[PDB]
Amino acid sequence: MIQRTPKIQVYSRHPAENGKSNFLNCYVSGFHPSDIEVDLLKNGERIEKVEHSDLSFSKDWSFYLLYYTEFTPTEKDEYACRVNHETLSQPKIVKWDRDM
């Protein structure tokens, strides 16, 4: 058996401009086993409004997932990716960093 902790990257499809329609992405990669919970949060609240995702498997025993939703960024809204996985002692919350 193998367990691997997920890598989590949160990023917008295009550079973020307030009031411009866009896509927010969570790429959750390199995790094992596949059991996982992933959500995008808008100021702490689960974004339900359509969710697309994409799962894949690499033969070194690792799963890869792209999770994304349409969003119009504003100055005041905070976004984060919330991930739970058995390798984590607590749910992991990774904030979207608009600038870096």
Q: Which of 88, 58, 84, 80 is closest to 11 using CA atoms?
A: 80
Cβ burial of 62 (10 Å; 0-12, 13-18, 19+) is: middle
Exposure letters 81-100 (e unless 16+ CB within 10 A, then b): bbbebeeeeeebebebeeee
Query: What approach was used to elucidate this structure?
Result: X-ray
**In contact, 87 and 1? CB cutoff 8 Å:** no
Q: 1-100 in CATH: which number?
A: 2.60.40.10
By three-state DSSP, how is residue 19 classified?
coil
Q: Which of 97, 96, 98, 50 is closest to 70 using CA atoms?
A: 50
Resolution for this experimental structure (Å): 1.8
